[PDB]
Design a protein around this nucleic acid. Structure first.
Lengths: 50, 79, 1341
RNA sequence: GAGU
């Protein structure tokens, strides 16, 4: 996004800014879940070979 | 089998007359059979439910993951 | 001015913008939708109505009989809420429907007066909804979750890149019905349009049009715009419209009129185009060179011989041109295909499709759908017809039709359900528009593209399916049986009705156990919205697409409330002010702004509507009842934010809190907290448990009143008046004549419920708030639910926390806490746990409940009555016997040694197992109550008889009280009536009370009201006396148990569970932790003042987690209590009313920028000192979300608390007396104890029950199960060289019977030798392989 | 509904 968040958590963000950040947040947490099963599976494959 | 058939045909009528359910006594009345016999048939009426039945609403368990063998005298008692 | 409860407790609100719209009823969705299902509205198509008329009236196949539906009546449900909860019944009402059989004649015309028989049949029971918006299913509280799904209509998607090294731009149209098989039109690599019906296989789209009744040339009309080609002499002319050229390099010298216009090769510009247009060109000379390569439209025959030459969609070559002009047709219809705008599409489709007529299209259709079934003509026709044009199979609904019609630019709202062929063609028209570049691609994810299914709409759905099965049975029976003699009630069975309904209610995904940990949990659950369910996605089926955060979610769903893990993205809470529109689409209320000035009008807009207009945020600064303060203002249009000037601005947000859900709205300084921790915060709040002692939160938002209000577990005054009687069980209020009905009596009775069991095993108790003789208003809080203070949400309790590192007791988010917490009994849970004792009947003999228990300590016998029932109020422990039970045994397996001893010592073995009801492991509390349900067959138990007699006299006493309380109201009213126009208080007072029916005064209003109230006595009397009979039909009746079960006893354990180390605690900010150690008061640091600390939280939990709002809460929290400090002091110091008033008001009016101005003045002395007492405990403030208290105003208040503005204080270590070298942040924060109790989390197993097939240890604390040592753990052992440990886990610890028993004995004997056997799992393996006919032998050496 |  072109315009960033100039403010800090000290000031507190508003409607818009906080909303903006949610995208990345949710994306991040969904990654921590669903994108880790790939790595687990990968590892098990390594295990079995070795 | 034929007795079971009677049961369920009558069940419909009785639910509609009462506005609710048929108690064994009331049912037993209309059939002119002994309540004990009715209750027996009600129990025997249960069909095989699967041992492999996913008990887990979340595919956790195939009913089997509950069942314990009471035949086994416990290692406590074997000692 | 304010109500009596607000006058009792104000919370200071730091809100800067004034909330114009009041917070909507939060449970509305549920209430109103369920209402729609049963709503008696004849013309209105809702629930029952809609379902019935859709199939009804059911006309006979033979045609000479018919079944008609008149109207229905809902019986008042036979089982009350309480009663169904008691017996484990589903709470429902009878539906009875008035139906008519009407019979025609054969021979005589169709004379409709042959046989007319009509009556009311019972159509089954309908599960009913509670006052709370909840449902009683098998005697447990369930909620039906709202369901998002993709709306019926048209979806136009692009596969961006997708497949191919090209990355072919390939589009698709998906046709979604409410009910019916699906249509897909998609683009092959070489641009040929393929159809997937029921998205099955890819056929040419043209085949579908063929089936639709279209000729090759008809399709080329409605798709391609023809070009007129004349042949004159040897030369060739086209009828050409000037605009057609448009962007086109010239191949010839184009001689129009006279002059050369287009140079051969020069790209045609707009100049050339307008020039020719104004010249008035019909015909233009062209070379025979141009047409070789074009296409021929119609199938022009050679009239002479009759011979066909150019076909429908054929390529043009030099020689055929000669043949055509030779056949003698003056006018030729070559095709328009330049690419660019109108490309080679329909043309190409027709070529790949070798099929021709309607019939062969229907054949290939049928052969894709049923490959291998012989193409009988009528079967194919019926298939295709029934696929899209069957009324019964295919319904798009107003939903589907409205969205469909909006995408294809139609004014018309409501459609005919079935696929009209215009629609179909329009579809392909718009797809191939987009392929040219005319349409936009739609996003599935648009809120306007996703519909929300509430209660009534879902119920209607599944109910309609019940009616479908009804049609198969009913209509079938309408034809066979002899019509005359047969009556309507014979035909109709309620079974499948109630089955399908109870299917939905019980078995469905959306119907779940309500979370009642606290009122927040319930309220939030009710309005949460899931993307799963029928017509919806599962976990694998959900990619990034719908999970990710859409700009449309603004003011509709909280972007910030969702379960972490695989559920994430799928389930989301409804935002605060948000509701469902007419079509179940999400909408948000917004303020109008007319010509610069901000009006007061609110309009609800859907997502689609929202895209259109330019909206200012709530945060934007507003000139007092005029315009906007800044010239260049902050707003968003068409989904995109930035700067606008005043005049351009159309609308505005009502308040900030509309962005966020209910849960998120409760968090105070969300503004300073990162979203990750925000998410966790909302989640934890949902798991907070009510303690013994409710405390109002120091730092709220203003929403804490609303939340409690809507939760509805609190009891609220529905008229207002004065409290006549106050009981910790009964609150009776005398209404003012204001709200008083001239019909009934004016006394309102609220019976409270104390200590009932929640689904979570938690506490549900009501405390009365107000006092006897208090005057209160409509909507005052009479009695509080569990986690509720005088109006306010009291989720948890607030403690003095000190942010500092301790000697590793606060290590990594771990918590240090004071013994003082237990001293005060804060954070002590009441858990009401339920156990059931079942006396079944085996053929081994019927089990019985008696005090008779072979080889038990008389310690265990002593607490039991003669019935074998635990005494009321006795406190017991895990392992202790509650209810005695005996079961049929059968021994006789005396192995040699046993017989010997039986002979010697005697002890004659009485056959009986120890079925008697044990208490759970490590659990100890008090029996709060006991219940007994005896089946009708066997006779009454001693204990049962006496307790059902207890309940008897209960009903009596309560009912007598009821009658007399309302009678007191009636009688009181008559005296107020008889004294107004007949001055007699001597004569009346001392005459008996029941002798006033005979009375008769002045005749007008006086007399009419008197008769109203007298007939109320007659009614009350006959009402009550049957009201009694009702409980006496219910209590007397033998209780209905499942087959095989003789009797049952429910027992409630009351455990007072004290906080300990390992319990789970958190704040609202996502900061959480386990109790590591409880320190004696002495250990904890203390103030200069001598006040010792309560909790010590690790500061290192702050910075990387990025929730700073908890710091803000801590500071504001100390100052809130600083307020309480000073006030408490002036209360102890008595002093004068005036001075207290001064301090208090100057406190409230602290903010230079505050909205809420509470100028005290007018308040009476009573109310003043009363208020002081309440704020003695520390003044409760309201920072609302985003619109909250700034740091400077907090600093300002810290001066009024006479405490450091930095909020840090120097602390003395209670152990050593040494000060900490620097000051630390101290202050009050609002803490909560979770539903996660270490008590439950403790579990261990040595030996117990094993698994049936594998013979491995079972799972769970429920079976005394062992942990799985998984392949992961295996790997660990393997990394070490630890072979024997591993082997233990594999054999002696699990499936090796001989091995585990032998090793057990070895351990006792002090051997510790292993000696392994063969694990049973491996044998399982062998046998299953041999079942598959695969030989596996283990080879000897 | 927990945590990694």
């Amino acid at each position: 996004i072109e315009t960033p968040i100039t403010a800090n958590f000290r000031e507190g963000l508003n409607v818009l800014q906080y909303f903006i950040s949610t995208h990345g947040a949710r994306k991040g947490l969904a990654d921590t879940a669903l994108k880790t099963a790939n790595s687990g599976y990968l590892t098990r494959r390594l295990v079995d070979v070795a | 089998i034929e007795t079971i058939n009677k049961l369920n045909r009558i069940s419909r009528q009785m639910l509609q007359e009462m506005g609710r359910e048929p108690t064994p006594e009331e049912l037993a009345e209309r059939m002119l059979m002994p309540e004990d016999k009715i209750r027996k048939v009600l129990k025997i009426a249960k069909e095989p439910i699967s041992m492999e039945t996913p008990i887990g609403d979340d595919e956790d368990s195939h009913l089997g993951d509950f069942i314990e063998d009471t035949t086994l005298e416990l290692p406590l008692d074997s000692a | 001015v304010y109500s009596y409860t607000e006058k009792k407790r104000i919370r200071k609100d730091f809100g800067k913008r004034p909330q114009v719209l009041d917070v909507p009823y939060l449970l509305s969705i549920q209430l109103d939708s369920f209402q729609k299902f049963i709503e008696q509205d004849p013309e209105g198509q809702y629930g029952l109505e809609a379902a019935f008329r859709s199939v009804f009236p059911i006309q006979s196949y033979s045609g000479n009989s018919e079944l008609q539906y008149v109207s229905y009546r809902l019986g008042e449900p036979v089982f009350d809420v309480q009663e169904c909860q008691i017996r484990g019944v589903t709470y429902s009402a009878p539906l009875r429907v008035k139906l008519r059989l009407v019979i025609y004649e054969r021979e005589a015309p169709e004379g409709t007066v042959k046989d007319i028989k009509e009556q009311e049949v019972y159509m089954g029971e309908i599960p009913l909804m509670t006052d709370n918006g909840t449902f009683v299913i098998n005697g447990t509280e369930r909620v039906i979750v709202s369901q998002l799904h993709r709306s019926p209509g048209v979806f136009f998607d692009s596969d961006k890149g997708k497949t191919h090294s090209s990355g072919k731009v390939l589009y698709n149209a998906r046709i979604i019905p409410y009910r019916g098989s699906w249509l897909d039109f998609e683009f092959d690599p070489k641009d040929n349009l393929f159809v997937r019906i029921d998205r099955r296989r890819k056929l040419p789209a043209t085949i579908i049009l063929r089936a639709l009744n279209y000729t090759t040339e008809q399709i080329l009309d409605l798709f391609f715009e023809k070009v007129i080609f004349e042949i004159r002499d040897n030369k060739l002319q086209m009828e050409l419209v000037p605009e057609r050229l448009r962007g086109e390099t010239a191949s010839f010298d184009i001689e129009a009129n006279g002059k050369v216009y287009v140079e051969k090769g020069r790209r045609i510009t707009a100049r050339h185009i307008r020039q020719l247009e104004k010249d008035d060109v019909k015909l233009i000379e062209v070379p025979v060179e141009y047409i070789a390569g074009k296409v021929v439209a119609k199938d022009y025959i050679d009239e002479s011989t009759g011979e066909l030459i150019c076909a429908a969609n054929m390529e043009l070559s030099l020689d055929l041109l000669a043949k055509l002009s030779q056949s003698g047709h003056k006018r030729i219809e070559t095709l328009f295909t330049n690419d660019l705008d109108h490309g080679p599409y329909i043309s190409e489709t027709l070529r790949v499709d070798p099929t021709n007529d309607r019939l062969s299209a229907l054949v290939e259709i049928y052969r894709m759908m049923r490959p291998g079934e012989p193409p009988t003509r009528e079967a194919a026709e019926s298939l295709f017809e029934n696929l899209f044009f069957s009324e019964d199979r295919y319904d798009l609904s107003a939903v589907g039709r409205m969205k469909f019609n909006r995408s294809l630019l139609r004014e018309e709202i409501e459609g005919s359900g079935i696929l009209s062929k215009d629609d179909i063609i329009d579809v392909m028209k718009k797809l191939i528009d987009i392929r040219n570049g005319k349409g936009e691609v739609d996003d599935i994810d648009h809120l306007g593209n996703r519909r929300i299914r509430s209660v009534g709409e879902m119920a209607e759905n599944q109910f309609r399916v019940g009616l479908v099965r009804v049609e198969r049975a009913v209509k079938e029976r309408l034809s066979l049986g002899d019509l005359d003699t047969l009556m309507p009630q014979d035909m109709i069975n309620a079974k499948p009705i109630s089955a399908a309904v109870k299917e939905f209610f019980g078995s469905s995904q959306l119907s779940q156990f309500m979370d009642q940990n606290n009122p927040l949990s319930e309220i939030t659950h009710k309005r949460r919205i899931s993307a799963l369910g029928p017509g919806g996605l599962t976990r694998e089926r959900a990619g990034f697409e719908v999970r990710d955060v859409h700009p449309t979610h603004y003011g509709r769903v909280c972007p910030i409330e969702t379960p972490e893990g695989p559920n994430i993205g799928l389930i989301n809470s409804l935002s605060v002010y948000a509701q469902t529109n007419e079509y179940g689409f999400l909408e948000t209320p917004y303020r109008k702004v007319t010509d610069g000035v901000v009006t007061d009008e609110i309009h609800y807009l859907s997502a689609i509507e929202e895209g259109n207009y330019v909206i200012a945020q709530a945060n934007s600064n507003l000139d007092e009842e005029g315009h906007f303060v800044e010239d260049l203002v902050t707003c968003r249009s068409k989904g995109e934010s930035s700067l606008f000037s005043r005049d351009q601005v159309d609308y505005m947000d009502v308040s900030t809190q509309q962005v966020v859900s209910v849960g998120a709205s409760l968090i105070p300084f969300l503004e300073h907290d990162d979203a990750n921790r925000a998410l966790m915060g909302a989640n934890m709040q949902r798991q907070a448990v009510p303690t013994l002692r409710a405390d109002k939160p120091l730092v709220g938002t203003g929403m804490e009143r609303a939340v409690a209000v809507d939760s509805g577990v609190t009891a609220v005054a529905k008229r207002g008046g004065v409290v006549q009687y106050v009981d910790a069980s009964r609150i009776v209020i005398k209404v003012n004549e204001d709200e008083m009905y001239p019909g009934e009596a004016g006394i309102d009775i609220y019976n409270l419920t104390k200590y009932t069991r929640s689904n979570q095993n938690t506490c549900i108790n009501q405390m009365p708030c107000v006092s006897l003789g208090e005057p209160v208003e409509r909507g005052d809080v009479l009695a509080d639910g569990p986690s509720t203070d005088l109006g306010e949400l009291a989720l948890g309790q607030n403690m003095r926390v000190a942010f500092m590192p301790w000697n590793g007791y606060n290590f990594e988010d771990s918590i240090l806490v004071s013994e003082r917490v237990v001293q005060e009994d804060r954070f002590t849970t009441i858990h009401i746990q339920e156990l059931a004792c079942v006396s079944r009947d085996t053929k081994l003999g019927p089990e019985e409940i008696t005090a008779d228990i072979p080889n038990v300590g008389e310690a265990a016998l002593s607490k039991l009555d003669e019935s074998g029932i635990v005494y009321i109020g006795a406190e017991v422990t895990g392992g202790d016997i509650l209810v005695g039970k005996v079961t049929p045994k059968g021994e006789t397996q005396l192995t040699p040694e046993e017989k010997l001893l039986r002979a010697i010592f005697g002890e004659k073995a009485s056959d009986v197992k120890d079925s008697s009801l044990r208490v759970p492991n490590g659990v100890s509390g008090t029996v709060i109550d006991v219940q007994v349900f005896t089946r009708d067959g066997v006779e009454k138990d001693k204990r049962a008889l006496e307790i059902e007699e207890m309940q008897l006299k209960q009903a009596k006493k309560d009912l007598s009280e009821e009658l007399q309380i309302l009678e007191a109201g009636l009688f009181s009213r008559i005296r107020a009536v008889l004294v107004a126009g007949g001055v007699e208080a001597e004569k009346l007072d001392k005459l008996p009370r029941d002798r006033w029916l005979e009375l008769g005064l002045t005749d007008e209003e006086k007399q009419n009201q008197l008769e109203q109230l007298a007939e109320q006595y007659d009614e009350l009397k006959h009402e009550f006396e049957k009201k009694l009979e009702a409980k006496r039909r219910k209590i007397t009746q033998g209780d209905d148990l499942a087959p095989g079960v003789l009797k049952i006893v429910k027992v409630y354990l009351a455990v007072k569970r004290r906080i300990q180390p390992g319990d789970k605690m958190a704040g609202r900010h996502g900061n959480k932790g386990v109790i590591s150690k409880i320190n004696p008061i002495e250990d904890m640091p203390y103030d200069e003042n001598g006040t010792p600390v309560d909790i010590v939280l690790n500061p290192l939990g702050v910075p990387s987690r990025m929730n700073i709002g908890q710091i803000l809460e801590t500071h504001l929290g100390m100052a809130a209590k600083g307020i309480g400090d000073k006030i408490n002091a002036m209360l102890k110091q008595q002093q004068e009313v005036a001075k207290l008033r001064e301090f208090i008001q100057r406190a409230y009016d602290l903010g230079a920028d505050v909205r809420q101005k509470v100028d005290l003045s007018t308040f009476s002395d009573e109310e003043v000192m009363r208020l002081a007492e309440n704020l003695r405990k520390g003044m409760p403030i309201a920072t609302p979300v985003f619109d909250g208290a700034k740091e400077a105003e907090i600093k300002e208040l810290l001066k009024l608390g006479d405490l450091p503005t930095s909020g840090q204080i120097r602390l003395y270590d209670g152990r050593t007396g040494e000060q900490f070298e620097r000051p630390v942040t101290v202050g009050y924060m609002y803490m909560l104890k979770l539903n996660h109790l270490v008590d439950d989390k403790m579990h261990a197993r040595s030996t117990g029950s094993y698994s049936l097939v594998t013979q491995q240890p079972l799972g769970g604390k429920a079976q005394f199960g062992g942990q799985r040592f998984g392949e992961m753990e295996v790997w660990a052992l393997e990394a070490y060289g630890a072979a024997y440990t591993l082997q233990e886990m594999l054999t002696v610890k699990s499936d090796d019977v001989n091995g585990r028993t032998k090793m057990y004995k070895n351990i006792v004997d002090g051997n510790h030798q292993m000696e392994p056997g063969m694990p049973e799992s491996f044998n399982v393996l062998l046998k299953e392989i041999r079942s598959l006919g695969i030989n596996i032998e283990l080879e000897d050496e």
